Amino acid sequence: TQPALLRLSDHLLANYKKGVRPVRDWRKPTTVSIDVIMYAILNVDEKNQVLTTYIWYRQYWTDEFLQWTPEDFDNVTKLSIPTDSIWVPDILINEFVDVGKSPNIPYVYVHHRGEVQNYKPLQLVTACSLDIYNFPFDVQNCSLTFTSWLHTIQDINITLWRSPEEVRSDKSIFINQGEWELLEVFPQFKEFSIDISNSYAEMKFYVIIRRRPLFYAVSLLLPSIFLMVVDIVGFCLPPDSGERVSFKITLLLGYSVFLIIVSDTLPATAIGTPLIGVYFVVCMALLVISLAETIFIVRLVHKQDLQRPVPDWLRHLVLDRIAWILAVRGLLQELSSIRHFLEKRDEMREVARDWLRVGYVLDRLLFRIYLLAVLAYSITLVTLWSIWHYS
Amino acid sequence: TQPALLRLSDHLLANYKKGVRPVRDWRKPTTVSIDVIMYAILNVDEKNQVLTTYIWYRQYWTDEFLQWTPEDFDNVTKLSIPTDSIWVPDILINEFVDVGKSPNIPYVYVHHRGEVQNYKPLQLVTACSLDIYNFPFDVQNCSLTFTSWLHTIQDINITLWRSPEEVRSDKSIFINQGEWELLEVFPQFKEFSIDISNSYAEMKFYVIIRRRPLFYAVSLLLPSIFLMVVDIVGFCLPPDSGERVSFKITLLLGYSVFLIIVSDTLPATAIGTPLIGVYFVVCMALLVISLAETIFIVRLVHKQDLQRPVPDWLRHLVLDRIAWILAVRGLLQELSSIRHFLEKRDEMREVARDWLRVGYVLDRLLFRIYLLAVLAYSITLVTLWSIWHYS
Amino acid sequence: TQPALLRLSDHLLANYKKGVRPVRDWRKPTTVSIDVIMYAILNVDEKNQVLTTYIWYRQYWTDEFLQWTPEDFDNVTKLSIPTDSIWVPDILINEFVDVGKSPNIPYVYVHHRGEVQNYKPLQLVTACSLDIYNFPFDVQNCSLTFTSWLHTIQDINITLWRSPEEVRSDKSIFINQGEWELLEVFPQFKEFSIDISNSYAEMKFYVIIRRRPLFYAVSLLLPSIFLMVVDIVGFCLPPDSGERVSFKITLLLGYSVFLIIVSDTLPATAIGTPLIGVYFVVCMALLVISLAETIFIVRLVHKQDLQRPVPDWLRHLVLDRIAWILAVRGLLQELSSIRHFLEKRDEMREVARDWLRVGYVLDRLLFRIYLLAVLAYSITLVTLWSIWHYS
Amino acid sequence: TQPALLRLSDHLLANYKKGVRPVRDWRKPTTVSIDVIMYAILNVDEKNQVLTTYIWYRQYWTDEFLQWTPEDFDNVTKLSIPTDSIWVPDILINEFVDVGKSPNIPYVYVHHRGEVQNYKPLQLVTACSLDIYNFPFDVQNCSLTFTSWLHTIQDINITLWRSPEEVRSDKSIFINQGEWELLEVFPQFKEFSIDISNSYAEMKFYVIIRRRPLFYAVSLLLPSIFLMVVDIVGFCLPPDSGERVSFKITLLLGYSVFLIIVSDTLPATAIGTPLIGVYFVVCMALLVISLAETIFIVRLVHKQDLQRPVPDWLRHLVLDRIAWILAVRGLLQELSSIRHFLEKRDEMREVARDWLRVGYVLDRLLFRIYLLAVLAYSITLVTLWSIWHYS
Amino acid sequence: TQPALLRLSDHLLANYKKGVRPVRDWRKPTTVSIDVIMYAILNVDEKNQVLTTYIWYRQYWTDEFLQWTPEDFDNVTKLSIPTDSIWVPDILINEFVDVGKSPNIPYVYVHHRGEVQNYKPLQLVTACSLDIYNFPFDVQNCSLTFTSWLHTIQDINITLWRSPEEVRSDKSIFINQGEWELLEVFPQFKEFSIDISNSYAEMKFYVIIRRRPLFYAVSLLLPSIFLMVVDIVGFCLPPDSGERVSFKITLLLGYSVFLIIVSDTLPATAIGTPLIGVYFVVCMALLVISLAETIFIVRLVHKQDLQRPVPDWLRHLVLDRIAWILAVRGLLQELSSIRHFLEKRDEMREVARDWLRVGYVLDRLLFRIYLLAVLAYSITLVTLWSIWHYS
Ligand SMILES: *[C@@H]1O[C@H](CO)[C@@H](O)[C@H](O)[C@H]1NC(C)=O
Ligand SMILES: *[C@@H]1O[C@H](CO)[C@@H](O)[C@H](O)[C@H]1NC(C)=O
Ligand SMILES: NCCc1c[nH]c2ccc(O)cc12
Ligand SMILES: NCCc1c[nH]c2ccc(O)cc12
Ligand SMILES: NCCc1c[nH]c2ccc(O)cc12
Ligand SMILES: NCCc1c[nH]c2ccc(O)cc12
Ligand SMILES: NCCc1c[nH]c2ccc(O)cc12
């Protein structure tokens, strides 16, 4: 005799005639109130300048045709109806690279005063400009805007639903333990117009995210200090031996191949030039000047075809030493000849020994200077890190 | 005269009016009982913190409108009808990264008392937090939650169908011989609420999986012990020869390039720091101190420009040896000069020989110390492995 | 006056009422006869344990509602109707990783006795367990099962259509000139049941495929024999020269980097351990012991700081040689001193020469032993290959 | 009593009969006016000769059946109706590689005079010919054409809507800070015909884009000048030492491996041959001739088995030096023999010294020539860069 | 009073009853005439034996139910109707790996005599057998076949539309400046039958394409001749120096790593063995025998522990030289002893000098032989290239 609640379900859907903007008067617009909450931040692609995010989105508006009195229908205040049977605004998002992949959820709440609500999850892979000038300590500011693609300001009006301060500070759900953590989501309403007599409404959410670089800092600092330490420990071997230049060029080749294979992996971009490359270039130049010093010292010490050092050089190298911290005539003729030969050989040996001593002293002094330079570089780096840590 | 069973098929579907929650009274909610069984575990992505699983899922609920007496229709108790002609709850899964790919199966059983059942396979690629602190011996605890996205607690209520102990211990179907094997699937019912006056029901299944690391253990241990053995066998060659430093730096370069090309392949993450990296750093430091010892020994042995060793040094190096386990005057003038030259050369040779002996003794002692250190490291590693094996 | 054949097309489709299992009596089940033929085998993924295949599939069953007399309708025995207007069983395939990509073909033959047939191509990417213990000479046994996901044994019954011996030996269409060639497709009917009072029917096809490894065999054998030959030819150079150890360590580094870059490319898995790795480890160990022999020989030959060899050593090294295949007193005082110095130098030279001869003899003997070992290894490898070739 | 605006919504859609080209007379064609605006330029693939772009596209035409008087319906001039209920032309784009991914936007404006408009975003990945002859300073000219695939010139006519000069200079929306920046979008109308009696209309937009190569220029110039500088600094070490050839071959191997790993990454194509490869080949040849010079100098200086240099050679090498910037008889018999031996040794030493001096002079001269050549190459390169900068 | 042309649009579509093969008599089949034109050739995958092509395809057939007199309907001869409202044959393509991605174009021309035409673009990624025996100069012959999947020969008959000679030579549209250029498209009609009493019609188009290898030829020839030239220039340095073997092994390692990293990139297959690998193996063997010659020459020249060369060897090495292009007794006793020591040293020096001269002569002769062999190889290669160029 008396059917179930469905007695009203057809009563609203008998002659609804969807596909038309539901208003009693066409002059007034329909107002849509939206709300977004972040759930997780998926990977960000610096090469393609595109990021992937996942949000829970909700909206509501007024139908003005789905109105009924609760008392007439068993106290019924709200119900759920399929979303394909009612008018739905076309609220899209700009700077999108694909339609995306998301479920349908073909249901919507409808209240007794015409208010209709829509809840949905949605994943966006979207293009924003990424700046990686300070690559490890990045703070990215990307934007996503909601707007009606075709309806103008006289048709659809965008409202923020919740208060902006509630939206800005909302960490109710967020997947931590990832590469990124968000700082805030700042909303802003704007009016967009390319030409005259045609304007639209947009709502832009600016997402601010910060990277945690501890893994990146370790992976970028450990090989560098490793090669610096091995260069320092390999500096202290005799220079006249021919293995010094081989050791230095082998270490330089190792640094070169490491730098090349890490040249584009970490700064995966085609525009930005982070300061990490500048520090790497500085380290490379330090290795180059160390190799040049080693080559010069090796060239200075070479026993064959030598000349006695010019007095002034020895006189100031001893000065900077204050701051480092019968027919018997043929018989005697032959003996005189062999003696003179031995004196010549001894003189060559003494000249070689003096040149070797000069090379040793110069090598020690230049090693001390290089150690001081490395100390200065390391202390100024840790000083800048402390300045970052304490603003 | 009398049609087939389809005489009831239209009788239930003549004026069903799908799209409305089927209840006689709107106050009571509709209860959905669900059940999941794992079938296989596909790949897990540590870089993206996402895994892929395949389950068989079933659910059932009560329609309260598809009711009939069996006796009236040729003893018919249950039938199958297309799933697009009846109301279906929107039971979704959170922490999902895509809609996924699964067939439709447009059929459902319906019993004579209104009970309706739904069976379906489904593959989920979903985001959970992976911890790889102990990378080879991982035990991952990931979660997947079933909930109604839009209907509240007053509309849909979630029930576990089978008993929790049956669900927890269920290995009826599972594809073994993979990288992972599951331990348990723990179910838990919860009530979810972000704001007030709006609450939902969720059912969370915690999947616990364990990795079998034998392949990983072999692939990570074989090159390490290979390079340790080759370092040990290359340690025992004469130090005064110049090939020792070249051999050591070549082996160090090999270890460096292997470590760099395996630096991110196995610990494919940007947060976690497994202890395998710590052991690799320890091995690298051991190689570095071995190279430093070789360089020091090479520097100590250098025949040119030497001085006699200070007595105390020789006196304690012989002490630690207890624990290692007429005008004929011009003629004689020339002969005296050449004799003195030969004495000078012999003295230099003797000094070089003494320094070489000192270097040999020190090299042998330091080799013994290094061998003892390697023995200690290897035995403590196998000891820790045994402690893991026997708790 | 008299329409075309379509006069019967509506006669069967006027009140068909699809979506219901077409039977006059609900007690008897509907029987579906299926048939599959392979067309080509696409790539197989050993890392993901998944393969891709392409088959032509056909099935037929009885409708019992699409029945007519041919004589009444211009001799018409069979026709074609859209597949969306008739009942279609939900015959799915387990161990599938995706819904796949295949066309629709919205047409089916229907005969005058109710028999209805369905033809379709379908590509499956499906998960099976791959064993690569003998990686080049693989014979893979994978399975694919057809079953009704939701209908039970009382509803749908599976039949093989053609005889099993015809299905097993069917090479009518197959794309050869690929990486794999199939041996047989063995069908087997089974009854599946997880719980009680609920059983289903499945038809499992076991596909057996064999790999042709000639390209793999060449690519795996050529570099190995290349490095063996270059090691053999580099073995025969003087040992006292310092380039021998450099040559050996360079070749060892080359083998190491080749093995590492081919460590996971060919055995692309995380479980299996093929014997090719065992042979590679054996070759590596052979190279290691060759390097150790070279280092020992180099250490044995070192002219500086030598002692005369102990008699017994020389006495058995000559034994194993049988099987390799006035004031004139100051003047004479100075002359005696210089003569004694020359005797000392000559004695050191003779000791060095004797030690060099000992090192040469030992190096030749160990080279012969190493060559014999390489010969033994190569002959036993070709012997095992012949045993494989002739069972 | 009086319904809403929907009173006209059915009035236009009661018997619209979509699917037919809406014209009162079939002889006249329907005219579609289109407009495109670039929004961003995504990645370009030089290997596949395909690019990805994102545009906002709009079009309008005349329906001639959706006509009404505003006064009759509450002043209503325009409305919005679903796009699936009206006739829509099939305006496609050639040289497309996929259907693409874009939303639907199922709404269109309709004016009271039958004018209907359609707005949509669309992303195209499309194939055009890329020329990279001057790879860093590229100016690409690609094309995209809009045409009706099936309707001929007698049915659909294409019009540009806005004036061509407005379309050509339109930077209202464009995502800068990318790899590319566009110069202009030139439109052109054309008539297309493959066979006779069948012609179509097309509208081709030529997009002109320019690359900003600063990152590419830095990444391509820094390693090159690095290796040039290290070659120059390693040139200045003594030639008789055996480490010079090792240093040169190590640097050549480094250049070779860098060139090979960058051989196809930057010029990612299979047709074009940019001039950067020509400059790299020139640098390689310079390194090769430097290595050949080093080998020749090393061969010239070799102390063992020497002959006195032919006079003419010394006489012109001193010429080019002007531009570089009793029974006592046995006793004396033995003394004469040993003296003659010492003279022979001294003569060999003097010959070796003279050859070493010759080698040193030649090495210095060739080093000066090589430095001059490097200076010439660097100055002509910077000169060509300046010519590019100032046309 | 009199409606538009749509007066006939319903007249054909009032009771069309699609889904049935439109014929007045079921005995005669329906004939479909097809035509294909290539537009561009996308990438070809040699690893997966699959290619991607893009064609414009058209077909037409006879409906026999869409017939009208033009005079009755305002001279109307042809119109356009949606393709979903009429019967469409299921003409598919075999050897396809996916459904593909193509637009719909829901429109078809219909003429007044029942002739209906369909135009569509379509991209196929399809599997054909690729032979790369002569990898740079490939001429691939792949096939694509059009057939009705389910309708037999008694239902659908395939016709070529245009004449075969017109189809074979058709370059009206084709995107040049790619990796491939097509030679011809040969059509062929065939009858296909697996079993008896069941036959179908197929139309196979054989596409013939040729590769342009200039980029491949340059990229494969430049490093090879580079390493040959550097080997030749490094051959000419003194053999007794220890850097020769290091240079040779370094160059061999460079060739090895280049060959390995290019081992599978260019011949990206698992079956074919191109002749380029044979030439690379020949070059490797040439480098190996050069290294063996260098090692033998180095072994022959070793000053320590030498014996005088056997006369015959010197006598034929001078022969092949024709074709290369009182108590004073103790005093004299000591002098005699030292003189004898000096004679012994001089004899050893002379023996070493003679052995060095022998080694130099042999090295020069073998260098000449190696140069002649390289000349022969290069000339026969350019000769074979000329034979290819002039058939
Ligand atoms: C781009 O190419 C088209 C095709 O030839 C040409 O008409 C047009 O002038 C070109 N534009 C520029 C800026 O070179
Ligand atoms: C291509 O292959 C088919 C199949 O055998 C053959 O009939 C045809 O002649 C071939 N075409 C050419 C140009 O070789
Ligand atoms: N199942 C989660 C329901 C839910 C609660 N709050 C929400 C906010 C937005 C949204 O899309 C969904 C929700
Ligand atoms: N064909 C397997 C039917 C089946 C048996 N038990 C199940 C449990 C869940 C499910 O989705 C399906 C099933
Ligand atoms: N066009 C191929 C028709 C055909 C013949 N035999 C078949 C077997 C199975 C199938 O799906 C299709 C077929
Ligand atoms: N929401 C942006 C609406 C808009 C303004 N101008 C446009 C031009 C083209 C287009 O597709 C869209 C638009
Ligand atoms: N817009 C191109 C129309 C066109 C002309 N000739 C064709 C041939 C085939 C085809 O699919 C299409 C066409």
Side-chain angles (χ1 to χ4, degrees), chain A residues 92 94 147-151 192-195 198-202, chain D residues 35-37 55-59 105 118-122 161 173:
Chain A
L92 283 189
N94 308 338
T147 183
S148 182
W149 197 264
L150 188 152
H151 297 266
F192 184 74
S193 182
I194 289 294
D195 61 298
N198 195 4
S199 55
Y200 312 86
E202 65 182 2
Chain D
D35 189 17
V36 295
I37 53 174
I55 69 170
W56 299 2
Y57 164 85
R58 57 178 171 170
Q59 65 189 355
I105 305 173
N118 192 4
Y119 288 59
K120 57 172 101 161
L122 61 85
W161 194 336
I173 53 166

Side-chain angles (χ1 to χ4, degrees), chain A residues 342-351, chain B residues 341 344:
Chain A
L342 279 161
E343 311 296 339
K344 176 160 67 174
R345 292 174 76 177
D346 203 0
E347 285 169 355
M348 307 282 153
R349 196 164 291 155
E350 291 298 323
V351 167
Chain B
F341 274 42
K344 176 160 67 174

Side-chain angles (χ1 to χ4, degrees), chain C residues 9-215:
Chain C
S9 172
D10 57 351
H11 166 260
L12 304 174
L13 273 299
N15 45 0
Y16 180 61
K17 306 310 188 199
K18 60 166 279 184
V20 62
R21 190 166 70 79
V23 287
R24 299 282 184 185
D25 191 8
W26 65 274
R27 277 147 193 105
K28 66 185 285 294
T30 174
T31 317
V32 185
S33 301
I34 64 173
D35 189 17
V36 295
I37 53 174
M38 290 290 310
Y39 180 81
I41 294 160
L42 311 183
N43 63 6
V44 296
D45 204 357
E46 290 87 359
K47 274 168 178 122
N48 295 83
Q49 303 268 299
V50 71
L51 74 165
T52 305
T53 58
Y54 174 28
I55 69 170
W56 299 2
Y57 164 85
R58 57 178 171 170
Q59 65 189 355
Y60 80 87
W61 66 95
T62 307
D63 207 289
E64 214 168 355
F65 283 140
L66 310 169
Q67 305 208 341
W68 78 91
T69 53
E71 272 66 40
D72 195 32
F73 297 109
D74 204 10
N75 295 121
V76 166
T77 317
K78 69 192 277 192
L79 75 164
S80 47
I81 53 178
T83 193
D84 70 62
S85 306
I86 56 149
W87 185 87
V88 171
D90 48 347
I91 302 294
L92 283 189
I93 306 160
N94 308 338
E95 62 262 11
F96 76 101
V97 310
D98 72 338
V99 65
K101 42 210 179 165
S102 295
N104 187 355
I105 305 173
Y107 287 119
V108 287
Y109 285 164
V110 169
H111 263 305
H112 71 115
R113 285 294 94 209
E115 188 182 355
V116 57
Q117 309 166 353
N118 192 4
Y119 288 59
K120 57 172 101 161
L122 61 85
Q123 285 100 10
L124 304 165
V125 57
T126 48
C128 63
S129 287
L130 280 73
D131 182 75
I132 51 161
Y133 187 87
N134 51 4
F135 158 76
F137 299 111
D138 277 328
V139 61
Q140 303 287 350
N141 177 342
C142 285
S143 74
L144 57 87
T145 182
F146 282 85
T147 183
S148 182
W149 197 264
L150 188 152
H151 297 266
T152 57
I153 192 67
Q154 288 84 19
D155 288 20
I156 304 183
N157 187 219
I158 308 298
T159 308
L160 200 48
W161 194 336
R162 290 193 298 164
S163 68
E165 69 275 16
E166 280 178 328
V167 177
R168 208 167 66 185
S169 66
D170 196 356
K171 320 285 182 65
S172 61
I173 53 166
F174 184 57
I175 299 299
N176 279 110
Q177 305 93 52
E179 190 175 356
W180 299 84
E181 57 91 19
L182 61 84
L183 301 176
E184 65 174 359
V185 182
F186 186 66
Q188 175 66 26
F189 167 79
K190 275 194 177 297
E191 200 161 352
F192 184 74
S193 182
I194 290 294
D195 61 298
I196 62 170
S197 86
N198 195 4
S199 55
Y200 312 86
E202 66 182 2
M203 181 71 68
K204 308 176 80 74
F205 295 88
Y206 300 106
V207 288
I208 320 296
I209 48 173
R210 215 163 57 204
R211 196 199 310 249
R212 64 179 64 88
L214 190 150
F215 159 81

Side-chain angles (χ1 to χ4, degrees), chain A residues 37 56 170 172-173, chain B residues 192-196 198 200:
Chain A
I37 53 174
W56 299 2
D170 196 356
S172 61
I173 53 166
Chain B
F192 184 74
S193 182
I194 289 294
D195 61 298
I196 62 170
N198 195 4
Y200 312 86

Side-chain angles (χ1 to χ4, degrees), chain A residues 140-175:
Chain A
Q140 303 287 350
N141 177 342
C142 285
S143 74
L144 57 87
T145 182
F146 282 85
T147 183
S148 182
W149 197 264
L150 188 152
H151 297 266
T152 57
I153 192 67
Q154 288 84 19
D155 288 20
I156 304 183
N157 187 219
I158 308 298
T159 308
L160 200 48
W161 194 336
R162 290 193 298 164
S163 68
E165 69 275 16
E166 280 178 328
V167 177
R168 208 167 66 185
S169 66
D170 196 356
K171 320 285 182 65
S172 61
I173 53 166
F174 184 57
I175 299 300

Side-chain angles (χ1 to χ4, degrees), chain E residues 139 141-143 183-184 186 206-208:
Chain E
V139 61
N141 177 342
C142 285
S143 74
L183 301 176
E184 65 174 359
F186 186 66
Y206 300 106
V207 288
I208 320 296

